[PDB]
């Protein structure tokens, strides 16, 4: 049923998510329904795609341990030695964790809209000093909390430790984590990282826009946080363009919001912006062309 070999890499394509919703009897709450039609697409284009289901809310390290094991499982099932890791948002540091502890199993790291240098939104939530802001922060936090609370007992129950998760995406936390997994991370505030280290290729591409299409129920929300992330808004609404640069930046100015990056919602995006599905299918080609 696969029509072409355009995204047929040597080593399998592994996608790691991050920051998602409650797993109701849907199909892939935080799996296939996270990467809207990217996976099946890359699948028909000849690729070998595996989505990883880690804890949505927990520390980069715990998520890392979770991911790693699935990575091994996959290596065992495929029989292929190394894998190509592709992480979105929190998935970014989450694949870096694996890269840092098993560089022999990792062929390439690709991070999309990852808060490597941290996210200002993460800090704000944790604030206590800044009474007025802190108010709206604690509040927003309580709501975001309420929304998942509305789910209740998660069938696929993953160790839920949101505090640590937040502390892992903070300006401090991300620095602390970088100091230990600095492979690919830039030394300059807003420069690139190493193209390759420990024989691993590293790529990062992100968006720098909040409002993409007003039909996206979430643009309203993303615009809110965009101002928290950066007044001048050089961000996807959550992660500044600077904090998302890692290794080789394919392109860091897509007319995509933090969700457009994963082709959300339902594939709603700016009028003239490149199609996530095709950008991914294009990256998948480059890895193949890199013999990865």
């Amino acid at each position: 049923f696969v029509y072409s070999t355009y995204a047929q890499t040597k080593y399998p394509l592994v996608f790691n998510h991050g920051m998602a919703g409650f797993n109701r009897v849907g199909t892939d709450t935080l799996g296939l329904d996270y990467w809207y039609q990217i996976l099946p697409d890359l699948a028909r284009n000849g690729g070998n795609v595996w989505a990883t289901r880690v804890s949505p809310f927990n520390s980069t390290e715990v998520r890392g341990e979770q991911l790693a094991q699935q990575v091994e499982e996959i290596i065992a099932i495929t029989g292929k030695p190394k894998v190509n890791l592709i992480g979105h948002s929190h998935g970014g540091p989450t694949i870096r964790y694996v890269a840092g502890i098993m560089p022999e199993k990792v062929a390439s790291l690709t991070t999309i809209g990852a808060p490597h240098k941290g996210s200002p939104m993460a800090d704000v939530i944790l604030n206590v000093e800044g009474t007025p802001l802190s108010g709206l922060a604690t509040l927003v936090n309580w709501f975001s909390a309420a929304i998942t609370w509305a789910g209740g007992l998660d069938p696929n129950s993953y160790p839920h430790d949101s505090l640590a998760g937040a502390h892992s995406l903070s300006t401090q936390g991300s620095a602390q984590f970088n100091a230990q997994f600095p492979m690919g991370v830039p030394t300059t505030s807003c420069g690139e990282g190493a193209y390759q280290e420990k024989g691993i290729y590293m790529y990062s591409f992100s968006g720098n826009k909040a409002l993409t299409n007003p039909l996206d129920p979430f643009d309203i929300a993303l615009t809110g946080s965009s101002l928290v992330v950066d007044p001048f808004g050089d961000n996807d609404g959550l992660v500044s363009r600077c904090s998302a640069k890692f290794g080789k930046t394919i392109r860091d100015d897509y007319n995509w919001n933090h969700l457009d990056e994963v082709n959300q919602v339902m594939g709603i995006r700016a009028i003239l912006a490149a199609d996530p599905v095709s950008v991914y299918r294009q990256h998948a080609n480059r890895l193949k062309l890199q013999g990865l």
Partner: protein, 285 residues
């Protein structure tokens, strides 16, 4: 290809896999879209004109008559399509309701009928559509709160079985990793035999995999027990009547006598931090 690609593509192939029929007539398939999208991606790096230049110059040098014509023709009608997708206004309703997403999809369908024919619409979108409709439908089957969950689940399974077999096989492939966890965690939650697990695995992944999986089990057991037994010795040193530097040195020595590589020393920190804070150690989730 340096004449056709944008700076970001200087490291890729051209996705234009355009199927020509048994008489040199462009047969519109899912890839035809991918082809356009490929060039369209240049927008944002390029201006709208360059995006046309490149595309035209590429097709000229690749395909001839008649298909060439048809291609550029459909391209023009696709671009003017991209732009005319801004002509969908937000309807007033709970922006988190299927009867919304549905309409938002309908609005596009109607625009498509403004630039393409049934045959073309089918060729360019059908595939994606199937999944879109599949996704939409599920939403309504979930939001229909006049059905029991036990019934919803049944309707979901029924709706799944309606997809073209291809999609079933593909999705099942993309969910295999989850299927493995599911059965591994179920079968082991009631203490099944190694043979049952062996068959269950042999069924879903095959012998070859099963064996390496078994190989992994062992490696995890090892690692796990190493950390287990490690933290015990670390706690003894912690609860000792010694000084900080002495405890840290003793610990260090224990760490270098069990975890040699820098790699293991990182992972250790993970468990250390979790343990020191009374969290459950991450081995099974």
């Amino acid at each position: 290809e340096n004449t056709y690609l944008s700076k970001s593509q200087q490291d890729t192939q051209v996705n234009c896999q355009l199927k020509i029929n048994s008489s040199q007539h462009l047969v519109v398939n899912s890839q035809t879209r991918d082809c356009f999208e490929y060039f369209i991606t240049q927008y944002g790096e390029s201006n709208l004109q360059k995006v046309k230049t490149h595309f035209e110059k590429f097709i000229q040098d690749q395909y001839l008559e008649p298909a060439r014509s048809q291609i550029i023709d459909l391209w023009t009608r696709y671009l003017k399509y991209r732009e005319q997708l801004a002509q969908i206004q937000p309807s007033q309703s709970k922006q988190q309701d299927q009867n919304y997403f549905q309409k938002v999809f309908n609005s596009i369908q109607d625009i498509r009928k403004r630039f393409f024919s049934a045959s073309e619409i089918e060729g360019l979108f059908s595939t994606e559509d199937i999944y879109q409709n599949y996704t939409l439908d599920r939403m309504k089957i979930l939001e229909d709160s006049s059905l029991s969950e036990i019934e919803k689940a049944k309707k979901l399974k029924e709706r799944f079985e309606q997809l073209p077999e291809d999609w079933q096989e593909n999705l099942q492939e993309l969910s295999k990793l989850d299927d493995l966890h599911t059965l591994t965690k179920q079968i082991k939650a009631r203490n099944g035999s190694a043979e049952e697990l062996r068959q269950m695995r042999t069924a879903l992944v095959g012998a070859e995999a099963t064996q390496r999986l078994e190989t992994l089990d062992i490696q995890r057991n090892a690692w796990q027990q190493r950390v287990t037994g490690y933290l015990n010795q670390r706690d003894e040193v912690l609860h000792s009547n010694m000084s900080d530097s002495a405890k840290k040195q003793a610990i260090q020595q224990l760490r270098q006598q069990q975890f040699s590589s820098s790699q293991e020393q990182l992972r250790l920190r993970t468990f250390e931090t979790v343990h020191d804070q009374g969290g459950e150690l991450p081995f099974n989730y």
